[PDB]
Amino acid sequence: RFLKVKNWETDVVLTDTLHLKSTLETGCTEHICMGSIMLPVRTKDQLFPLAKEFLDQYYSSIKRFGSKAHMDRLEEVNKEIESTSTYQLKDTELIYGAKHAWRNASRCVGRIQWSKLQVFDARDCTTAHGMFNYICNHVKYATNKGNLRSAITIFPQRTDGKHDFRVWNSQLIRYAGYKQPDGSTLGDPANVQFTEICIQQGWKAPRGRFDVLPLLLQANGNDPELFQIPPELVLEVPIRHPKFDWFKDLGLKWYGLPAVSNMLLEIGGLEFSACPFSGWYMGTEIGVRDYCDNSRYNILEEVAKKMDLDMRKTSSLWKDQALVEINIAVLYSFQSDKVTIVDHHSATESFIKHMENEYRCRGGCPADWVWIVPPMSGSITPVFHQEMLNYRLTPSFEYQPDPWNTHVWKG
Amino acid sequence: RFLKVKNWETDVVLTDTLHLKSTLETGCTEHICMGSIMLPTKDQLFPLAKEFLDQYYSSIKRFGSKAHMDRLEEVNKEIESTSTYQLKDTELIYGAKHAWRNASRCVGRIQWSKLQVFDARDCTTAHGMFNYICNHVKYATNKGNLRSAITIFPQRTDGKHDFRVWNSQLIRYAGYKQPDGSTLGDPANVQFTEICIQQGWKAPRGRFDVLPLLLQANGNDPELFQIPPELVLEVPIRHPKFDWFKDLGLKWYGLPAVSNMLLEIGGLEFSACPFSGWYMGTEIGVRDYCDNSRYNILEEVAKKMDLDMRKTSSLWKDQALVEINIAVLYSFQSDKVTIVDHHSATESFIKHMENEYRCRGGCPADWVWIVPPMSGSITPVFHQEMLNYRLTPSFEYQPDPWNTHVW
Numbered sequence: 173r174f175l176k177v178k179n180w181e182t183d184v185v186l187t188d189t190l191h192l193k194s195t196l197e198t199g200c201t202e203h204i205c206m207g208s209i210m211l212p213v214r215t216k217d218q219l220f221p222l223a224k225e226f227l228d229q230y231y232s233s234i235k236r237f238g239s240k241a242h243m244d245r246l247e248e249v250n251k252e253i254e255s256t257s258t259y260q261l262k263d264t265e266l267i268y269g270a271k272h273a274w275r276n277a278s279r280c281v282g283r284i285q286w287s288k289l290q291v292f293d294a295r296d297c298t299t300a301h302g303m304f305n306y307i308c309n310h311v312k313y314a315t316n317k318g319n320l321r322s323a324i325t326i327f328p329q330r331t332d333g334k335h336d337f338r339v340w341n342s343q344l345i346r347y348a349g350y351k352q353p354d355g356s357t358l359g360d361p362a363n364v365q366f367t368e369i370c371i372q373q374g375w376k377a378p379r380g381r382f383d384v385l386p387l388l389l390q391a392n393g394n395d396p397e398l399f400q401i402p403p404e405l406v407l408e409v410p411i412r413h414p415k416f417d418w419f420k421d422l423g424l425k426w427y428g429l430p431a432v433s434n435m436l437l438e439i440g441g442l443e444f445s446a447c448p449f450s451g452w453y454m455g456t457e458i459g460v461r462d463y464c465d466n467s468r469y470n471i472l473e474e475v476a477k478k479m480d481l482d483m484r485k486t487s488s489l490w491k492d493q494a495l496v497e498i499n500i501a502v503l504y505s506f507q508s509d510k511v512t513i514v515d516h517h518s519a520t521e522s523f524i525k526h527m528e529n530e531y532r533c534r535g536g537c538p539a540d541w542v543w544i545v546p547p548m549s550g551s552i553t554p555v556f557h558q559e560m561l562n563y564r565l566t567p568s569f570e571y572q573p574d575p576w577n578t579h580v581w582k583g
Numbered sequence: 584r585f586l587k588v589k590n591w592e593t594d595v596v597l598t599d600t601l602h603l604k605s606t607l608e609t610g611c612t613e614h615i616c617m618g619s620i621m622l623p624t625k626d627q628l629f630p631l632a633k634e635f636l637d638q639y640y641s642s643i644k645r646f647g648s649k650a651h652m653d654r655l656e657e658v659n660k661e662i663e664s665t666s667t668y669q670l671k672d673t674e675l676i677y678g679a680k681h682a683w684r685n686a687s688r689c690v691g692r693i694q695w696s697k698l699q700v701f702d703a704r705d706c707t708t709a710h711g712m713f714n715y716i717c718n719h720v721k722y723a724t725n726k727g728n729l730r731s732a733i734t735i736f737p738q739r740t741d742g743k744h745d746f747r748v749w750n751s752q753l754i755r756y757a758g759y760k761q762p763d764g765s766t767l768g769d770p771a772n773v774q775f776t777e778i779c780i781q782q783g784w785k786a787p788r789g790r791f792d793v794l795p796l797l798l799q800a801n802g803n804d805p806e807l808f809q810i811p812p813e814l815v816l817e818v819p820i821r822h823p824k825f826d827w828f829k830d831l832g833l834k835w836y837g838l839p840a841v842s843n844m845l846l847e848i849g850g851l852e853f854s855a856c857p858f859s860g861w862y863m864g865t866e867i868g869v870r871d872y873c874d875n876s877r878y879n880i881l882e883e884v885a886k887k888m889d890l891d892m893r894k895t896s897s898l899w900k901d902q903a904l905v906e907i908n909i910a911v912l913y914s915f916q917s918d919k920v921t922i923v924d925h926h927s928a929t930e931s932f933i934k935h936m937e938n939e940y941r942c943r944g945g946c947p948a949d950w951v952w953i954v955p956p957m958s959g960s961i962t963p964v965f966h967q968e969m970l971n972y973r974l975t976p977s978f979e980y981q982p983d984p985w986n987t988h989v990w
C-alpha cells in the first residue's frame with residue numbers, strides 16, 4: 173500500500189511506504205480522528221519479537237542483514253531473554269536506538285539534526301548521586317558555553333517496574349512556580365506542583381520569579397533525592413529587545429538548554445524510563461508558549477501596555493503585535509549572547525527539506541501537523557501547506573505517568 | 584466509546600457522546616492519522632431518508648408520533664415509486680442549517696441557526712439560476728450588514744441533469760498567465776478564468792477582475808452571466824497608520840460565497856447550493872494576500888515598512904503579516920462591512936463548542952482548520968482538544984465540473 177502527500181503551495185507530491193512498518197496505534201479510527209488529542213512489567217512472550225524486529229532493523233542499517241554476526245546476536249539475545257527475561261543492548265545498538273527514536277519523533281520539527289546526537293551511556297549508574305554526576309556532565313557538554321550540542325544520557329532500563337530510574341523533573345532546567353495565598357502565581361505556573369514536591373522534600377526555595385529548580389532523582393526504585401545543579405553550569409540569557417529599551421526592564425530571562433527528562437525511551441522492547449535529552453530552542457517555544465500562554469508567564473498585556481497599543485478592541489490585533497515583538501526579543505537576546513537558537517522560519521524550512529530527504533532515502537517521514545506547525549505565523553511557514561502522515565515507528569520516545577502518582581514510598 | 588476532550592488552558596473537560604452517531608468515514612486508521620490531508624439506489628436511499636427523518640422529528644419533539652410514522656411511509660412510498668423523493672420546506676431548512684452545524688472545519692458555527700434558506704428547487708434554466716444568485720447576493724450583502732444565506736437548486740436525479748455553479752465562489756478575481764512568466768491577478772483562478780475565455784468571456788485583463796458566473800442548469804452546458812457590478816460590494820484596503828498602504832492598490836470583496844460544494848440531506852444530493860456568511864479577517868489578510876500561491880504581497884509590504892529582510896530571524900515576515908491583517912480589519916470596519924477578527928471568532932467558537940456539548944452531547948471539530956493561520960496559540964482554540972468526525976446532513980466537496988461534464 174502506497175500513500176501520497178501533497179504540498180499545496182509547491183504541488184510537490186511524495187509517496188510514503190514507510191508507514192507499512194508501523195506497529196503501535198494512533199488513537200484514530202475510521203469513524204473518528206483524534207489527531208488533536210494531546211495524550212492518546214512486560215513478558216518474555218512479547219519481548220523476543222520486539223528484540224528481533226529491532227535487531228533486524230539495526231543489522232540492515234549496517235548492511236549486515238542475515239550475516240553470521242546478525243544470526244549469532246539474535247541467538248545470543250534469545251538465550252539471554254529466556255534465561256533472564258530481558259537483555260542488554262550493545263553500545264552500538266543503544267546509540268542506533270537513541271538516534272532512531274529521535275528520528276521517529278513525529279512531533280519534532282528539529283529532526284534534520286537526528287544523526288548528530290551525543291549518546292551518554294549511564295547504564296552503570298546505581299545511585300541518585302551517580303545520576304547527578306552524569307546529569308551535570310550532560311549539561312556541561314550540551315551547553316558548551318553557548319554553542320549547544322544535542323545529547324542524551326541513558327540510565328538503566330526498567331526491570332520489574334519496581335526498580336525504575338526516574339528523573340522527577342520534567343526538564344533538567346526549569347523555573348520554580350509558587351502559588352500565593354491571593355491566588356496569583358510567582359514564577360512559572362507550569363511548575364507549581366513540582367515546586368511543591370521539592371519544597372516538601374526539603375528544598376529551601378528562594379521564592380523569586382526565576383528560581384532554577386533542584387533535581388529530584390530516583391535511582392533503582394528508591395525514594396528520590398534532591399540536588400542543586402551547580403549555578404555555573406546553568407547558562408541563562410537576559411531578554412532585551414533591539415529597538416525597545418524598556419524591554420529589558422520587564423526583568424525577563426530564560427535558560428539556554430531545553431532538556432526534556434520525563435520521557436520514556438523504548439528500544440527493542442526495552443524500556444529506559446530515565447533518558448534526559450537536550451537540543452536547542454526554537455524561539456517560539458520561549459516567546460510564544462513560555463512567555464505568552466495565559467497559563468504560563470502571561471506577559472502579553474504588560475508588553476502591550478508598554479508599546480501603547482490600542483487594547484480596547486482585539487480587532488486592533490494588539491496581542492499579535494506584542495507577540496511578535498516578544499519573539500523578536502527572544503531571538504535577538506540569544507544571538508547577541510551567542511547562545512544557539514533557531515527561528516521558526518529557518519526551522520520549518522529545514523524540516524521540509526529533512527522531510528523530502530526522508531521520503532527518498534527511507535520511504536517516509538511520520539509527522540504530526542498539529543505539533544510541527546509553529547504556534548505563531550503558521551501559514552507563512554512552509555510546513556502549513558504540507559500534508560503529513562502521522563504514524564508510530566520504534567524506537568520511540570513515549571510519555572509516562574508522573575512519578576509522584578505511581579511511586580511506592582519507602583520512607 | 585465515551586470520549587473526553589480537555590482544554591489545556593482552562594482544565595475544562597467535556598464528554599463527547601455525539602460521535603456515536605457518526606456515519607461517514609474519516610480517512611484515518613488505528614495505524615495512520617490523516618488529519619492533515621486536505622481531501623482524504625433505492626436501497627441506499629431509504630435508510631438515509633429514515634435516518635434523517637428520525638432526527639428531524641426528534642428535533643421537533645415528535646419522535647415516534649403518528650405524523651412521524653406517516654411521513655416515514657409517505658417517503659418510503661415515494662422512493663419505491665419515483666426512485667427518489669422530495670423534502671418538505673421545513674425539512675429542507677432543517678437540513679441546511681444542520682449541514683452548517685455539522686461542518687467540522689467551520690469556526691463560525693455559533694451562527695448556525697441564523698441561516699436564511701432560499702428554496703430554488705423550482706429553477707429550470709441557467710437564466711433562472713442567475714436571478715436567484717443575484718437575489719442571494721443582494722440579500723446577504725445587505726449594504727454591508729452581512730446576513731448568512733444559502734440558495735438551493737434542484738437535487739441530483741440521474742447525475743446527467745446536474746445543477747452546478749462552475750465558479751468556486753460567487754465572487755472571485757480572475758487570473759491570467761503572462762508571457763513574462765508571471766501571473767496577473769489571483770493565481771488560484773487561472774484555469775477557471777481560461778475556461779471563461781473559452782466559453783467567450785471578454786476579460787479586462789486586470790488584477791482584480793470579478794469573474795462572471797458559469798451556470799449549469801439541468802445538466803445542460805454552462806452559460807456566462809455577469810453579476811451586476813452594483814451588487815458586488817468591495818473594500819479598498821488602507822492602513823490606519825501607514826499612509827503608503829493604499830498605494831499597493833489592494834481591495835477585496837465583502838461577500839464570501841462558497842459555490843462549489845455538495846449539500847447532502849437524507850441521501851439527496853444538492854450539487855448546486857451556494858452559501859455565504861462573512862469573512863474572518865485572516866482569510867483575506869493571511870491566506871489571500873500572503874500565501875505564495877496567491878497574491879503573495881509579503882515582500883512588497885515588508886519593503887515599504889523598511890524592515891531588515893536579510894535574515895529570517897528579524898521576523899520581518901511576521902511583522903508585515905500583522906500589519907496586513909490590521910489593515911484588512913480596519914478597512915472593512917471603516918466601510919461598515921461585517922468582518923470578524925480571529926480572536927473574536929475563536930472565542931465565539933469555544934462558547935459554541937461548550938453549548939453543543941451541553942445541548943447536543945458534542946461538536947465535531949477539525950483542529951487543523953479551526954486554528955487560525957496566524958497567532959494560533961494566543962487564541963483559545965489552540966489549547967482545545969477537538970474530536971473530528973463526520974455527521975449528516977453535510978457539505979462535501981465534489982469534482983470540478985469541467986473534468987466531468989459531457990460537452
Ligand code: HEM
Pocket residue numbers: 270274277279280281282283285289322323324449450451452453454457514519543569
Ligand atoms: C536540536 C534542536 C531541536 C529543536 C529545535 C527541536 C524542536 C522541537 C519542538 C519545537 C518540539 C515541539 C514541542 C513543543 O513545542 O512543545 C519538539 C518536540 C519533540 N522533540 Fe525536538 N527539537 C530538537 C532536538 C531534539 C532532540 C535532541 C530530541 C531527542 C533526542 C528531540 C525529541 C523530541 C521529541 C520526542 C518531541 C515530542 C515531544 C512531545 O511529544 O511532547 N528533539 N522538538
Ligand code: HEM
Pocket residue numbers: 683686688689690691692694698731732733858859860861862863866923928952978
Ligand atoms: C457567518 C460567518 C462565517 C464565518 C466567520 C465562517 C468561518 C469559516 C472559516 C474561517 C473557515 C476556514 C476556511 C478556510 O480557511 O479556507 C470556514 C470553513 C467552512 N465553513 Fe464557515 N464561516 C461562516 C459562515 C458559514 C456558512 C453560512 C456556512 C454554510 C451554510 C459555512 C460552512 C462552512 C463549511 C462547510 C466550511 C469547510 C469548507 C471546507 O471544507 O473547505 N460557513 N468557515
Ligand SMILES: CN(C)c1cccc(CNCc2ccc3ccc(N)nc3c2)c1
Pocket residue numbers: 282342343362430432450451452453454457
Ligand atoms: C507541561 N508540559 C506540556 C511540558 C512539560 C515539560 C516539557 C515540555 C516541553 N516538551 C516538548 C518538547 C520536547 C522535546 C524538545 C526538544 C527540543 C526542543 N527545543 N524542544 C522540545 C520540546 C512540556
Ligand SMILES: CN(C)c1cccc(CNCc2ccc3ccc(N)nc3c2)c1
Pocket residue numbers: 751752839841859860861862863866
Ligand atoms: C477548491 N477549493 C479548495 C476552494 C475554492 C474556493 C474557495 C475555497 C474556500 N473554502 C473554505 C471556506 C468555506 C466556507 C466559508 C464560509 C465563510 C467564510 N468566511 N469562509 C469560508 C471558507 C476553497
Ligand SMILES: C[C@H](O)[C@H](O)[C@H]1CNc2nc(N)[nH]c(=O)c2N1
Pocket residue numbers: 180556557558559560619620621951952953
Ligand atoms: C495541509 C493542510 O490540510 C492545509 O494546508 C490546510 C491547513 N489548515 C487550513 N485551515 C484553514 N482554515 N483553511 C485552509 O485552507 C487550511 N489549509
Ligand SMILES: C[C@H](O)[C@H](O)[C@H]1CNc2nc(N)[nH]c(=O)c2N1
Pocket residue numbers: 208209210542543544591965966967968969
Ligand atoms: C490541543 C492540542 O493538542 C494542544 O494544545 C497542542 C497543540 N499543538 C502544540 N504544538 C506544540 N509544538 N506544542 C504544544 O504543546 C502543542 N499543544
Ligand SMILES: [Zn+2]
Pocket residue numbers: 200204205206207611615616617618
Ligand atoms: Zn486522525
